[PDB]
């Protein structure tokens, strides 16, 4: 939630601007929870799965702020408590 100018120079009228992520809805598979999910996902999360070489990997490799989502951080509790027992 930020602000811009008109034609890329300071001496013009000031405008507000909301940048939003492009939202994909892809289907994934969790090897540890053995159910498939229907998940709202972005470009860079998909790239963060491949750069982590796994989706069960990514939810256990990131701290709180790096995913920053109540569902994915519940997946961090839900999957790792499966591992705890």
């Amino acid at each position: 939630l930020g602000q811009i100018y008109a034609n890329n120079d300071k001496l013009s009228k000031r405008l507000k601007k909301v940048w939003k992520p492009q939202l994909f809805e892809r289907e994934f598979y969790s090897e540890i929870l053995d159910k498939k999910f229907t998940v709202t996902v972005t470009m860079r999360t998909l790239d963060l799965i491949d750069e982590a070489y796994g989706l069960d990997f990514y939810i256990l490799k990131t701290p709180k702020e790096d995913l920053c989502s109540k569902f994915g951080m519940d997946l961090k509790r839900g999957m790792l408590l499966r591992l705890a027992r």
């Binding site: 929870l33 159910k35 519940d74 997946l75 509790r77 839900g78 999957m79 408590l81 499966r82």
Partner: protein
């Protein structure tokens, strides 16, 4: 085109919290704190069943788990069904034959000059003027008030020949008694549930009018078919019903036989009333219903043709027009559309008076229609006497 828009239908549930889609954990909800919290997970509640049972909060089972949800559909008649084809629909589902006009023996009882009430032209005009002008405190009575007064005051006039005829003391007029009768037509089951007012009861049978040669003469007549109207239209389709035949009374009841039925159009509104074409259809069904209540009682539940037939008449009215019907029941094997059949003598559009002016009309200070009935017909009261004296 589906009826009922989305905004007025049942609201869809909110999409489920994603806490449920992980099988590893249990959800942390506001089941503990017994109030809504927006920042806790949405709980699922168990289907709650009322442990006790309550009279003012009773819930019925659905219509596939009642004690009697039988698959065969019955079709039931009551006092509110308004037939589409009118009499022609009522003729087929009774298997009765239409003869226009009252028979010769009924009209012969009023032909004798001694069988007249005193002032039969004047005392009717006093009953009309009492009910439609003189009854209430209000200036004009509505049809829901003077229609039950006219016939039950005209009964009182017809009852006053009891000194002349001592057989008139064998009758009562019970109100609010419910009869029923069932019959099968070609396949399907049909029922009457007669819930009406003022049936007048006698302990003697009414004598048969039509001879057995006339009943033998009914084989040649074919029931008139009509298509694309099926003869089931505007009857209550009910899949939950008990096949029962009721005479309206238990065993050992004095006056066990109906004599005449006093049907009415008691509504104030013409859309809420019965048309004369539809009112004579209820005359066929209640008179057949009270007659078939005794064919299922005095002879049992067998399909045959009656040796000593039963006859029940009926009197129909609106408050201004009168209809008269005598129904003769003589067959019970109603599954076949051929063979013998019943016969009924009806009377169409037989009006007591044309108009009643309850208040004077003014057209430049000079009255053109004074108070009282206009177009009064004294012939209808003879017919209403003739049905009252039949069999007595």
């Amino acid at each position: 085109y589906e009826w009922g828009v989305r905004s007025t239908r049942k609201s869809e549930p909110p999409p489920l919290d994603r806490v449920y889609e992980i099988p590893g954990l249990e959800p942390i909800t506001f089941a503990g704190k017994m109030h809504f919290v927006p920042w806790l997970a949405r709980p699922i509640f168990p289907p709650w069943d009322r442990g006790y049972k309550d009279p003012r909060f009773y819930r019925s089972p659905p219509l596939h788990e009642h004690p009697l949800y039988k698959d065969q559909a019955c079709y039931i008649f009551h006092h509110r069904c308004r037939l589409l084809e009118g009499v022609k629909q009522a003729l087929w589902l009774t298997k009765t034959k239409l003869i226009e006009g009252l028979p010769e023996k009924v009209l012969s009882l009023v032909d004798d000059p001694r069988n007249h009430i005193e002032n039969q032209d004047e005392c009717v005009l006093n009953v009309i003027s009492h009910a439609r002008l003189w009854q209430t405190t209000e200036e004009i009575p509505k049809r829901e008030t003077y229609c039950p007064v006219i016939v039950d005051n005209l009964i009182q006039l017809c009852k006053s020949q009891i000194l002349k005829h001592p057989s008139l003391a064998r009758r009562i007029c019970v109100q609010n008694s419910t009869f029923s009768a069932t019959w099968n037509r070609e396949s399907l089951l049909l029922q009457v549930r007669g819930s009406g007012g003022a049936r007048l009861s006698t302990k003697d049978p009414l004598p048969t009018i039509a001879s057995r040669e006339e009943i033998e003469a009914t084989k040649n007549h074919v029931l008139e078919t009509f298509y694309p109207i099926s003869p089931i239209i505007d009857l209550h389709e009910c899949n939950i019903y008990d096949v029962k035949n009721d005479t309206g009374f238990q065993e050992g009841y004095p006056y066990p036989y109906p004599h005449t039925l006093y049907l009415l159009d008691k509504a104030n509104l013409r859309p809420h009333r019965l048309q004369p074409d539809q009112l004579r259809a209820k005359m066929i069904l209640f008179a057949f219903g009270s007659a078939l209540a005794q064919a299922r009682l005095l002879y049992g539940n067998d399909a045959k043709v009656l040796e000593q037939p039963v006859v029940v008449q009926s009197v129909g009215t609106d408050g201004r027009v009168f209809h008269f019907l005598v129904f003769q029941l003589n067959t019970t094997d109603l599954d076949c559309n051929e063979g013998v059949k019943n016969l009924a003598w009806v009377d169409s559009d037989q009006l007591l008076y044309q108009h009643f002016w309850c208040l004077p009309v003014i057209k430049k200070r000079v009255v053109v229609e004074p108070v009282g009935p206009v177009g009064f017909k004294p012939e209808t009261f003879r017919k209403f006497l003739a049905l009252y004296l039949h069999g007595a």
